[PDB]
Design a protein around this ligand. Structure first.
Ligand SMILES: [Mn+2]
Ligand SMILES: [Mn+2]
Ligand SMILES: [Mn+2]
Ligand SMILES: [Mn+2]
Lengths: 455, 455
DNA sequence: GAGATGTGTATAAGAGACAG
DNA sequence: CTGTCTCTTATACACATCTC
DNA sequence: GAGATGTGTATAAGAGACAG
DNA sequence: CTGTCTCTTATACACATCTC
């Protein structure tokens, strides 16, 4: 359980069909060093190793390596791990990778045709287990450049959703039935909803456009407001800093929001498709605040306050893909790379997508047992030494809850908002520190184990 | 020689007259943690220490702490260290500290009155020893905000140079005679040159404006072109990436530049002051390249090709203050701080000026003996373990030249341009890594020294 | 089998970045 | 303002690996 | 001497940042 | 798009330190 990075890389890319085993091999080593030195330049991850550095750069530049094949490999590993869960969540969303150095000119449009910043549009599908909600891994990804003139686009971007569904359906095979897609408003596309339904595929999409109900003859919102109040729930909206359109600074104070919840069956005109819907609307919202609300369409049953709370709960996790994105950028450093050719940059950033998931997964592994479960006796001992006189009586002596706060404490976590949760980023610094320290801890050991004055 | 940070902070700020010993004390601890965690947030530097974090923030916010007094303290330490060198270089230049968060509005103007980015203008005087050219430390600093309307400025910014000279003359006292000021073109101000001369103060300033010579009746450049060619020298201009006004990308290839050198005495109209001058002009410059040239005014003698090469050499180091600036920002993170009040931000960034010099000094300490001279036996051993099988036959077994490349190699240095020199930044990562590892190395030791299974 | 493609070592140098 | 390096890309040689 | 100012611990929350 | 935390700032209490 030490140099996980190395074992990790192997389990993820060992099946990579790069057309040549040597390529597949190099892929696994490149990944391992990147994973070990998360968010660091290839150079640093090489550990002064010229043959390594040269091996890496040669790989992301090798005209024989399909960035798709790489991505494909990582996905297959996800399918494999998926085989052990009863219910899976497939978060689906899009993000952009933006660059401003020479290679930008050969990249697609992200904003205004005159905008210097250009890059790629990526549509990913991150898998989770609907039980404890842990990140299984990346199931699919679609990369594409947006032309300056839409009249040149080979296809409408909106079809991405149907694209994702297609590949997802192909890779997960008989496990699709255990999958529940989760997408934001932009997914409100009857051509999508129709598809999923045609395949008995489960899903949970948020409503954007006002639609009508065949029977009710009303707008979904108006038809659901009539259904009996199944009950409700509450959420604590945390305080944060905000930035208005003007560019100034507005504060969003904390406040507990009470919500009313309803549910029912709707039917849309096109394809005359039928499904259930849920409408969650805030309760007595503050004067200077917009009344919180959600209206989700889905195949999942919602006849009971519990079955509906399940839908609200599932959709609440869609935000995981947002954290994935931050991990892919600020984390693994996708937008920090400076390759000078499209294919090259794609090859690097493609590997980093997986090196981005791992950061998430790392924090989750230390989140609910004992430390000996994930940590090795050596590092577990060192962490204990380092964390000496810093643990709260709230945590056991050597529990999986202690290691969390100990590793996190290395990362600098001071629980400023006293919430207990530490950012995956602070938990990573800790892991990185602990491991770094483990080098010296194991070094002193190796020398004393062969007889040598260490002080 | 271990937790230098701690001893360091003490030697620099222990004399700080913050009006209360407790304040002075806190100052030293705050510095020590910042120095230990260079370029990191106060939080991280606190090592999970609530009483520390709270102590730091309380300090940079304490209405009783004069940011000047802090700076003053660090300067006095410089004067002290200066006492051991025959000849000192006082590089003088200005830089700006720019911020874009709310506190900006209360800060001075850096650009256009409408510009969001605002902050401070700082005029520093960094001391060096004219022999080996090591960084002694910060001798003076002037902080000031530029008003939106120049009609409100209490004084002309141009007088800063005379300001710096005044304080420098006051703190260095009888050691001013061993000092040589070094300033770029913007210092071409007869009111300055006149001052220094009036105080028998030495200096080396680059020429900007065309001036005439009382005798020669010519322009300095034209009067020096007549003097006999004292000889010359060569310099290797290193390849780099450049950015044109248009914003594109132009390459500046490497090339050895041959220069012709002359010298003579000039005399300006105002105050009818007299001094020596040196004119170094390139030789057979490339078609698409501007003919390199320097014309420096100074009190230092230049009658011989050696005495003149000394002036060219001295002025060549003025660029050290440019590295200081990068160290103050990208390094210590001056522009990364987010204090919400002017005085507060000043107090933090003021401390960081010194925590910025140390990064420079650190790289210099490992630059030309043996490692045992700077490194402790413990860390020296660990570095050797870590650097096992990575040293070139070019470096001794355990020399002060080996540690350099070993520590640097930890930092990732791969000598891409094969120049041998490593950035102070890469040498810092190494030092940081080594020390981090030293924690585990010393931990395993402490436990085995008391009998405990370490594997 | 005959002809590429990757590995380690070396040598050079364009692109980038941050500070002028 | 005479910059200082680090990140990326190639090329070449002697072998070691693979593909068609 | 009488009256502040800093230290450690605790409790809360506005500002910032990066991704929507 | 129902965000998630980390960086900065205060306040209060019981003492420990300092200043005028
Ligand atoms: Mn979206
Ligand atoms: Mn200047
Ligand atoms: Mn400058
Ligand atoms: Mn999104």
């Amino acid at each position: 359980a030490l140099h996980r990075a190395a074992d990790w890389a192997k389990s993820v890319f060992s099946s990579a069909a790069l057309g040549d085993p040597r390529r597949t091999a190099r892929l696994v080593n490149v990944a391992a060093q990147l994973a070990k030195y998360s968010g660091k330049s290839i150079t640093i991850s090489s550990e002064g190793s010229k043959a390594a550095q040269e091996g890496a750069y040669r790989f992301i530049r090798n005209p024989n390596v399909s960035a798709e094949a790489i991505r494909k490999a990582g996905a297959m590993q996800t399918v494999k791990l998926a085989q052990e869960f009863p219910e899976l969540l497939a978060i689906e969303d899009t993000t952009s990778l933006s660059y401003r150095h020479q290679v930008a000119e050969e990249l697609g449009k992200l904003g205004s045709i005159q905008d210097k910043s250009r890059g790629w549009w990526v549509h990913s599908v991150l898998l989770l287990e609907a039980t404890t909600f842990r990140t299984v891994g990346l199931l699919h990804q679609e990369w594409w450049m947006r032309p300056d003139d839409p009249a040149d686009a080979d296809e409408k971007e909106s079809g991405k959703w149907l694209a994702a569904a297609a590949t997802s359906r192909l890779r997960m095979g008989s496990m699709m039935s255990n999958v529940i897609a989760v997408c934001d408003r932009e997914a409100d596309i009857h051509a999508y909803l129709q598809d999923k339904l045609a395949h008995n595929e489960r899903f949970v999409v948020r409503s954007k456009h006002p639609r009508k109900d065949v029977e009710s003859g009303l707008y979904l919102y108006d038809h659901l407001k009539n259904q009996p109040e199944l009950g409700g729930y509450q959420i604590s909206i945390p305080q944060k800093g905000v930035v208005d359109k003007r560019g100034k600074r507005k504060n969003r104070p904390a406040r507990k929001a009470s919500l009313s919840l309803r549910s029912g069956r709707i039917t849309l005109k096109q394809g005359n498709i039928t499904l259930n819907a849920v409408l969650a609307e805030e309760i007595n919202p503050p004067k200077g605040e917009t009344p919180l609300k959600w209206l989700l369409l889905t195949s999942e049953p919602v006849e009971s306050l519990a079955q509906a709370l399940r839908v609200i709960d599932i959709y609440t996790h869609r935000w995981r893909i947002e954290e994935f994105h931050k991990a892919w950028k600020t984390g693994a450093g996708a937008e920090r790379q400076r390759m000078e050719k499209p294919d090259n940059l794609e090859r690097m950033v493609s590997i980093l997508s997986f090196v981005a998931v791992r950061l998430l997964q790392l924090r989750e592994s230390f989140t609910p047992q004992s430390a000996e479960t994930v940590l090795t006796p050596d590092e577990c001992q060192l962490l204990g030494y380092l964390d000496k006189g810093k643990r709260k009586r709230k945590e056991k002596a050597g529990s999986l809850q202690w290691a969390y706060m100990a590793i996190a404490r290395l990362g600098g976590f001071m629980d400023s908002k006293r919430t207990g949760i530490a950012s995956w980023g602070a938990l990573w610094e800790g892991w990185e520190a602990l491991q770094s320290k483990l080098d010296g801890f194991l070094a002193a050991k190796d020398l004393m184990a062969q007889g040598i004055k260490i002080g």
